[PDB]
Design a protein around this ligand. Sequence first.
Ligand SMILES: NC(=O)c1ccc[n+]([C@@H]2O[C@H](COP(=O)([O-])OP(=O)(O)OC[C@H]3O[C@@H](n4cnc5c(N)ncnc54)[C@H](OP(=O)(O)O)[C@@H]3O)[C@@H](O)[C@H]2O)c1
Ligand SMILES: [Co+2]
Length: 309
Amino acid sequence: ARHFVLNTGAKIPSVGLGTWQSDPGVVGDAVYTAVKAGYRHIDCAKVYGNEKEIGLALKKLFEEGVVKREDLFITSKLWNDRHAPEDVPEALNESLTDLQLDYLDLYLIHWPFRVKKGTNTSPENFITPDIPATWGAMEKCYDAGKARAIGVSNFSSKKLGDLLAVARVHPAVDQVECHPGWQQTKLHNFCQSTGVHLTAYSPLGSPGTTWMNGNVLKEPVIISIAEKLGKTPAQVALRWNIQMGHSVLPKSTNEERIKQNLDVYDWSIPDDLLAKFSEIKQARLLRGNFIVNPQSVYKTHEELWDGEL
Ligand SMILES: NC(=O)c1ccc[n+]([C@@H]2O[C@H](COP(=O)([O-])OP(=O)(O)OC[C@H]3O[C@@H](n4cnc5c(N)ncnc54)[C@H](OP(=O)(O)O)[C@@H]3O)[C@@H](O)[C@H]2O)c1
Ligand SMILES: [Co+2]
C-alpha cells in the first residue's frame, strides 16, 4: 500500500508531507522530522516561499545519511506568473536552486490560471491561460531530466482531458483537494480511465485554515469508523483516500501527528464501513475565489471547476 505507480513507471510514496503554510524555521524541522519518522515524499511549491528552508532540511538529511536523494520523492509547482513558455524552465531552475537539487521527481502546473510575470493576482495582471503552450515547455523540462514527471494541480476532468488530448507527455498527476467531505468521484473515475494519478491535497479538510472552515474530522461517520477500528479520525480520513488509490499530502508541524499520519498502511476500512462514506455531506473547501472574477477567464466557480463544485 506504500507506493503508487505513475504512468512514467516511477513510484510515488502514498503519503507525503504537505508544506503549504509552514513559517520560518518550522517547515525545515517538519521535513527533517517527517523524513526520519519515515516519510519519503515532500510536496513543495514556489509560491509558498519556503523552498530554501526545505532545501536546507534535505541537505541535512542527506549529509547525516538519513536518506539518499533517490530515496525521496520531491514535488514542486510552477506558479501562475510563469506560464509563458520561456519562463517555465527558468522557474523550475529557481525551485531547483532553492531546494539544492538537480531534479524534481514531480513538477506541477499549480493552477489553470495565468498572470503577467512578476505580478500578483489582481485583475490588471490576468493573462488568458495557454495550457498547451505551457505544457510544451513543461515537456522540455521533462525531456531535459530536470523533472522526472510533470503534471498539473487544480485541473477538472474536462481541463485534464483537454490537456491529455493535445499532450505528447501525459500529465503524471492531478493534485487536487480531496477528502471525505470532497471525494472527487468524477475526477477519480476519469483519472482511472486515463492513467493519471490523483494526489489528495487537504486530505484532512485543512482544519487549521480559517477561511476554508474545515470540520471534516468531525463527521460522525468518520468518528464512528475511528472508534470501531481504534484509529484517529485523521488516520481514517487518510486511509480512505489511500484505499481509493490516491496519494495524500497531510500537512502538519507536530511530531506525534506526523508519525500518526504515516500509520495508514497495514490496516483497512472494511467494506461495510467504507460504504458509509457515501453518507458524508459534500462541499468543496478551497473554492478558488482568488481567480473567480468578472475579468477572469473563470467568471463563476463552475467555469473554474467545470461543474465539480
Ligand atoms: N496544489 C495546491 O493548490 C494545494 C492547495 C492546498 C494544499 N496543497 C498541498 O497539500 C497539503 C495538505 O493540505 P493542507 O495543508 O491544506 O491541509 P491538511 O493536510 O488536510 O490539514 C492540515 C491541518 O490539519 C492539522 N493536522 C495534521 N495532522 C493531524 C492529525 N493527525 N489529527 C488532527 N489534525 C491534524 C494540522 O495541524 P498540525 O500542524 O498541528 O498537525 C493542520 O492545521 C499542503 O500542505 C500542500 O503541500 C496544495
Ligand atoms: Co497521448
